[PDB]
Every structure is written in C-alpha cells, then in structure tokens.
Structure 1
Amino acid sequence: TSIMAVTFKDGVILGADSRTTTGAYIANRVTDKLTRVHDKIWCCRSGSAADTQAIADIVQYHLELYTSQYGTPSTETAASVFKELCYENKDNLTAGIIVAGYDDKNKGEVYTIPLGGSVHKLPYAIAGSGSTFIYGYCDKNFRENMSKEETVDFIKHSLSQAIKWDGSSGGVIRMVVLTAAGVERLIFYPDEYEQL
C-alpha cells in the first residue's frame, strides 16, 4: 500500500496505488484505495482491508447522519470520527487512514491517523508500505500552495518511486481531486509513471 494526500491552493488531492497483495501474490491489481465518506471528504486506507473498509463504512454512516441532522460536516469532524473509532478499538484494529477534505470555510485539509488512533494535521501526509521509500524525496520536493498540475505531478512522482521500490505497491495510480469545482477522478497507467 502507498497512499498520500496533499493540500494545494485550489483544494486537496489524494493519491494511491491499486495493488492489494496476500503475501507475495497480487490478489487485486485494480483496487480503489480512495474511499469517499462524504461529498468532499475522502480517505486513503492502508493495513487490514476488512478493518479499513469497516471503519470507512461506519464513518460514512455517521457522516450521513450528521448531514441529516446538523448539515455538512467539516473535515475535522470526519477526522475526529475516524480518530475515535481507531483509538477506542486500537486493540483489534490495524488501519492507517489519511482523511482529506475540502470545504469552503477552511479550504482543503489533510489529517492522518496512524496506528494507535492518533490524529495529526499536515499540509501533506504519506503512509502505507511503500511510503518509507519516498519520505526524503517528498520532503525535498513538497511546496506550499502548489497548482493542480504540479501537485498531480508531485504525487505521481512520489507514488511511482514507491511503486518501483516497494513490491507491495503497484498497479495504477488513482487520484481524487477535491476542489471548489467538485470531485475529479484521475487514473495514471504504468506506461506513464514507469517512464518517469
């Protein structure tokens, strides 16, 4: 698993790979690791697929109820829901979740929830198996208030390096862009990022 979420001027972009493996076997090479918990609040998942999917389902239920009761929730609200779920069930959960959301009040925001349930707000967050390999690179290339195209290129480069070095990551690069215009889905095939 190789997931990340980067905030830029026009909003936020979440990127991930599509490789889910059971040991050394490519179980699924077309996995959508970006899950939508609200209209403009998405999450990248890593770890136990069942645990992450269950947490995402429960968060989506809670956010739909929050929308029906008190209107659109902020990104911090979904982050706190994820945090409470992961912390109060830390003894039976193995999930790392990067929650990225764009609202008109706070522009774009990225929170990360590592194991143990902790929550940390970052301008950009990286996680997953391959994340390690692209730590330094990201720290050497990330910039504040980037444009959409340069942010896409940054995420593409980082995920391509992670895929190339990590055997647990691969497939295609899936990105979801949350901006004032709405939600955009981008897919980048191997021939694009391998040639990089």
Structure 2
Amino acid sequence: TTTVGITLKDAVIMATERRVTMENFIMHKNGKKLFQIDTYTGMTIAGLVGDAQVLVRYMKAELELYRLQRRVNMPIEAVATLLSNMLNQVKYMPYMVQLLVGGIDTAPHVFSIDAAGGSVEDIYASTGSGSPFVYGVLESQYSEKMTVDEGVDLVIRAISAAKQRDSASGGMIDVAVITRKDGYVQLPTDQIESRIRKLGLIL
C-alpha cells in the first residue's frame, strides 16, 4: 500500500493507490483505501484489510452521530484523539493498521495514527510499504506555497514513484481534495488519468 496526505493554505489533499496483495500474490487490483468520513474529513487505511475496514465503518458511524448530537462537525484533532483512544485501549490485541486522518476545521490538518494509538500532526505524512519513496519525493519537491493544482500533481507524482519501486503498491491513483468551500471532492478518474499523461508517466 501507499497512501499520502498533504496540507496547503486552505486545502488538504489525500491520495492512495488500489492494490491488495495476500503476500506476493496480487489478489485485487482495485480495492479502496481512501474514504470520506465526515463533511470535511477523510481517512486513508494501510495494514490488515479487515481491521482497517471495521475502523472505517466505526468512524463514519461515530462521526455522523457526533454531528447530529452537536450540530457541528467533530474537530479534526478530536477525530485523531478518538482513534488514539480506540487503538490504545486494545494495544495488546490491536487493530493492525496505519491511518491518516485529514480534514478542515478552522484550519487544515493531517494526522498520522499508529496501531498503538500514537497520533501526530505533521504538514505531510505517508503510510504503507511505499511510504518511504513518497517521503523522498515530498522532501525534495514539496512547498507550503504550492497551489492546489500543483499539489494534486505532486501526490500523483509521489505515488507513481512509489508504485514503481514497491511491489506492494499499484493500480489507479485515487485523489481527494478537501476545501472549506467545496468540501470533500473526490477527483474523477478521467481527470487524474489526464494528469498522469500530462506529467508523462505509467500504470
């Protein structure tokens, strides 16, 4: 797996790829690892597929319930703190996952959460077996000043590198842009394919 999350001025961009392996055997080319879990919040999952999925459902549920009881969306830091507690409570029988939780409250935020419930905010983060290659690309090419279209390209690029050097990663790239104005928008396939072509790339 390769998932990545970056923050900008008034935006958050999340991307994954879609490959699912049971060892070296590519069982599904087209799984889903990026999920919207609130109006302005998304989550990416890496690690054991079963555990990750159970958590996606709990989160969707518990964040929708929060919203109705409070009439505001759960602050992104609160979402991370909630998960911190859930995962830690069961650290010795854990959910075997790596989560990125990204979104917009008063500002933008990306949080990275481990299987023991340690949560940390950074201005970018990546998770999964392909994550070090993304970190390489981001270290070199990321700027806080980047526009949204510059950022969308950046992640497409990063993941496309990760894909080439991680046999655990592959398939079409999913991207989502989260803004205060238009909310969580999942960029449509044909627009992403268009940019892979324009940057000159493969899968």
TM-score, length of structure 2 as denominator length: 0.89
How many Å separate the matches in 2 of 1:116 and 1:138? 26
Q: Which residue of 2 aligns with 1:22?
A: 22
Q: Distance in 1 between matches of 2:200 and 2:58?
A: 36
Q: CA deviation digits over 1:146-187, x for unaligned, max 9?
A: 211110111011100000100000001100111122222223
The aligned amino acid for 1:67 is R
Of 91-100 and 138-147, the range deviating more from structure 2: 138-147
Structure 2 match to 1:116: 116
Shift of 1:194: 6.9
Structural mapping, 1:109-188, within 5 Å = 109-179=109-179, 180-186=181-187, 187=189, 188=192
Question: For residues 56-90 of structure 1, what are the alpha-carbon distances to aligned partners after superposition, in whole Å with 9 as ceiling and x for unaligned?
Answer: 21122211121111122111111111111111122
Instruction: List aligned pairs for 1:1-196, cutoff 5 A.
Output: 1-71=1-71, 72-92=73-93, 93-103=95-105, 105-106=106-107, 108-179=108-179, 180-186=181-187, 187=189, 188-189=192-193, 192=197, 195=201
CA–CA distance in 2 between the matches of 1:111 and 1:62? 18
When the two structures are aligned, how many residues end up with a matched partner? Answer: 194
Residue type of the partner of 1:81? L
For residues 115 and 158 of structure 2, the distance between their equivalents in structure 1, rounded to whole angstroms, comes to 22
SS in 1 for 2:137: helix
Aligned mates of 1:35, 1:82 — CA distance in 2 = 15
Aligned-pair Cα RMSD in Å: 1.8
Determine what percentage of the aligned residue pairs are the same residue. 27
For 2:85 and 2:145, the matched residues in 1 are separated by 30
Greater strand proportion: 1
| Structure 2 unaligned blocks of 5 or more | none
Alpha-carbon distance between aligned partners in 2 of 1:110 and 1:56, rounded to the nearest angstrom: 17
Alpha-carbon distance in 1 for matches of 2:91, 2:52: 12
Q: Which moved more, 1:32-41 or 1:185-194?
A: 185-194
